[PDB]
């Protein structure tokens, strides 16, 4: 009722397992701590004497009955879990903040993080982690200034842990007004963020390199069986473009179920389980979860990353010394396509 600690001198902080009841069932013993916890952070004050009256009636009784005791615990749990739900969804505006989290971690906005790659293509070196770290935040805000969020949002900061192997994105949330949002939760969001940038980067490269028309066939008739790379650009593009579309379905389904569950329930304790199903579903269903599938897809990404450099530096029609690497590449594509039919079966 008061949320007061210093209730046990000898035999946040929680209750010790040694003195935890087993003659009271354990889940009921879990709820008691949560109700005590929420006070420390309306009409809770109005019904305090009634809760004291029920507890006093429990003091009066000679007998002990869990079937009776649990109803007191459940009845107080309803209101105390309701209060936080009443505040945070509306007055801390959980849902819009979740949209912002999707925009920046789950790339619900991808406009910024593409033009960002456009103006920060100078990171291929090993960073000294004292110069590149400043440069990435400078480039981040400066890219944002050209269009879209030219009023505030200095809240996210980039920082490093090639120049892309070290990467980290932060976002300070209102910690008393968000205990659902925890640093661990943001850690998982960071992992998904880094993967989603990798996929965009390699594909932006590959789609940029196809200008065979635009500069390399204009006013030329080009040599067949010299100007061809097996045209494997078109093969490598499909497995990224369909995956690109697959992530859209994967994202929007999970976003929708979370915003359905939160609307239905009117207690914060439920919101905990809803969020805790949501993030794990993202992990497992985008196949970012640690699998052999994850290894095979990383092999695909590495092959595309190496292939883009070869098609980049060639420019105007030339076929000498590029074929030697290209042969290794087409053999590797055969090897990994056989694995792509292993994920299928």
């Amino acid at each position: 009722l008061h949320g007061l600690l210093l209730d046990q001198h000898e035999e946040q902080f929680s209750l010790r397992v040694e003195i935890l009841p087993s003659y009271i069932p354990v889940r009921v013993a879990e709820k008691i701590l949560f109700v005590g916890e929420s006070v420390q952070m309306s009409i809770l004050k109005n019904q305090e004497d009634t809760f004291a009256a029920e507890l006093h009636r429990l003091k009066q009784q000679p007998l002990f009955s869990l079937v009776d005791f649990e109803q007191v615990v459940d009845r107080i749990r309803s209101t105390v879990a309701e209060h936080l739900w009443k505040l945070m969804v509306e007055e801390s505006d959980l849902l819009g903040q979740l949209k912002i989290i999707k925009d920046f971690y789950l790339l619900g906005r991808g406009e910024l993080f593409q033009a960002f790659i456009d103006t920060a293509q100078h990171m291929l070196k090993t960073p000294p982690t004292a110069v590149t770290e400043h440069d990435v935040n400078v480039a981040f805000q400066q890219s944002a200034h050209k269009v879209l969020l030219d009023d505030d949002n200095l809240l996210p900061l980039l920082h490093l842990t090639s120049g892309w192997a070290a990467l980290g994105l932060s976002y300070k949330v209102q910690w008393p007004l968000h205990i659902l949002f925890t640093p661990a939760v943001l850690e998982k969001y960071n992992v998904v963020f880094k993967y989603l940038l990798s996929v965009r980067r390699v594909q932006a490269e590959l789609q940029h390199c196809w200008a065979l028309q635009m500069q390399r066939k204009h006013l030329k008739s080009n040599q067949t069986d010299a100007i061809k790379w097996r045209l494997r650009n078109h093969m490598a593009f499909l497995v990224d473009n369909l995956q690109y579309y697959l992530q859209v379905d994967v994202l929007e389904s999970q976003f929708s179920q979370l915003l359905h569950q939160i609307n239905s329930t009117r207690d914060f304790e439920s919101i905990r389980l809803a969020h805790d199903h949501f993030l794990s579903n993202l992990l497992a269903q985008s196949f970012i979860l640690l699998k052999p599938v994850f290894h095979c897809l990383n092999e695909i990404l590495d092959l595309c990353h190496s292939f883009c450099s070869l098609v980049s530096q060639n420019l105007g029609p030339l076929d000498e010394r590029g074929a030697a690497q290209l042969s290794i590449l087409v053999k590797g594509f055969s090897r990994q396509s056989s694995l792509l039919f292993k994920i299928l079966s």
Partner: protein, 420 residues
């Protein structure tokens, strides 16, 4: 980033005027450029963030013998945009020679907006094929445009000019325009005046104000093509990202249009996907089969059923698309655009590579062949003789369009691992 649009000819100026008006009507703005109080979205794709909180569209106006330009002048949509870009025959050779002498000043008009823009992404062309004033002039300016800037993209919105009989010099004009349309353009969205006229006489009983309603159709198509760019989307928020997937071969760049409601004056996902798939909702009219299809949907759509929709349209198995290497019909899903009232919510637009346009090409090639063999319909002028004394530009266009029909037909074959 930033895309600069071009319009020339009276028909091109009509469709651009309607497009800018229709996007003024879509966006929460006044016809002066003033923002409304209920605005957000991305409004830098064709709109200059101008100097009085005006979103001024970046449009190049080109006109010869101005008739419609005065009607565009005395309008409250000349307060929306006025970049002072106005600069003053009915043959391709005449328009070519008239564009010849004044290329530097209109190129200064180009470079004015080029330096005025911080970034550049592509050039969209509103050009009417065999439009009289537009023909020749548009071909010359297309040639100079891709000559100057090979680092950008070109889209050209084109009509197929034949009202099925009239003018006997029009196949020559459209043929020369088609030669430049092949080799000097990187993406062509072709429209049929016959198919649009048939659908207009289908859904309504109008056949006389056909230009005015066709303006409505093309403006809706052009807005729906850009909704993922103008509103916050995720894929093909640049032009080139859209153009890249559709083209497997750099001369196979001809794009087919359909639209899921036919009359515009609850359904599920796979329904309107299937109806967009049919050729009778396709508004442009041996085997002919699609290379690759891309489709965009905008409306009230339940998003979680799209994968079962995808399965159902798969096992319905409506098109036997291609032999050699694997394309797909590829979906994109968008939100219905806010900031305006919206009737007929579920609306889809499809971009497809189909070899069936080779039939229309063979149609106009046969028309050119009979008019060339008869030799009383070339309408010999000094413009055509001074431009080309032996008229071998027609021969070059003829062998190129033969190569393109060969490309279409050999792409339809199971073997296009050999070229042809």
């Amino acid at each position: 980033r930033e895309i600069i649009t071009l319009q020339l000819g009276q028909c091109g100026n009509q469709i651009g005027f309607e497009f800018w008006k229709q996007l003024c009507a879509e966006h929460g703005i006044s016809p002066e450029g003033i923002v409304e109080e209920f605005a957000t979205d991305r409004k830098d794709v064709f709109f200059y963030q101008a100097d009085d909180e005006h979103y001024i569209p970046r449009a190049v106006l080109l006109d010869l013998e101005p008739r419609v330009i005065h009607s565009i002048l005395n309008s409250p949509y000349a307060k929306l945009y006025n970049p002072e870009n106005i600069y003053l025959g009915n043959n391709w050779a005449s328009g070519f020679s008239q564009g010849e002498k004044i290329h530097e000043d209109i190129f200064d008009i180009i470079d004015r907006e080029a330096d005025g823009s911080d970034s550049l992404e592509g050039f969209v062309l509103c050009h009417s094929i065999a439009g009289g004033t537009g023909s020749g002039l548009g071909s010359y300016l297309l040639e100079r445009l891709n000559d100057r800037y090979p680092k950008k993209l070109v889209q050209t919105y084109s009509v197929f000019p034949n009202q099925d009989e009239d003018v006997v010099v029009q196949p020559y004009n459209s043929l020369l325009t088609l030669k430049r349309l092949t080799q000097n353009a990187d993406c062509v969205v072709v429209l049929d005046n016959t198919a649009l006229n048939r659908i207009a006489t289908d859904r309504l009983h109008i056949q006389n104000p056909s230009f005015s309603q066709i303006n409505q159709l093309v403006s809706t198509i052009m807005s729906a093509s850009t909704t993922t760019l103008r509103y916050p989307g995720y894929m093909n928020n640049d032009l080139i990202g859209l153009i890249a997937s559709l083209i497997p071969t750099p001369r196979l760049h001809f794009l087919m249009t359909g639209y899921t409601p036919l009359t515009t004056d609850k359904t599920t996902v796979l329904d309107v996907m299937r109806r967009l798939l049919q050729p009778k909702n396709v508004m442009v009219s041996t085997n002919h089969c699609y290379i690759a299809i891309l489709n965009i949907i905008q409306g009230e759509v339940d998003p979680t059923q799209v994968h079962k929709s995808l399965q159902r349209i798969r096992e319905r198995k409506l098109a036997n698309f291609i032999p050699w290497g694997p394309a797909s019909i590829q979906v994109a899903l968008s939100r219905k655009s806010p900031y305006l009232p919206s009737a007929h919510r579920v609306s889809g637009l499809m971009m497809a590579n189909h070899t069936s346009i080779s039939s229309l090409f063979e149609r106009t090639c046969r028309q050119y062949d009979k008019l060339r063999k008869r030799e009383a319909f070339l309408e010999q002028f000094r413009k055509e003789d001074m431009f080309k004394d032996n008229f071998d530009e027609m021969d070059t266009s003829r062998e190129i369009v033969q190569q393109l029909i060969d490309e279409y037909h050999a792409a339809t074959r199971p073997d296009y691992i050999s070229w042809g």
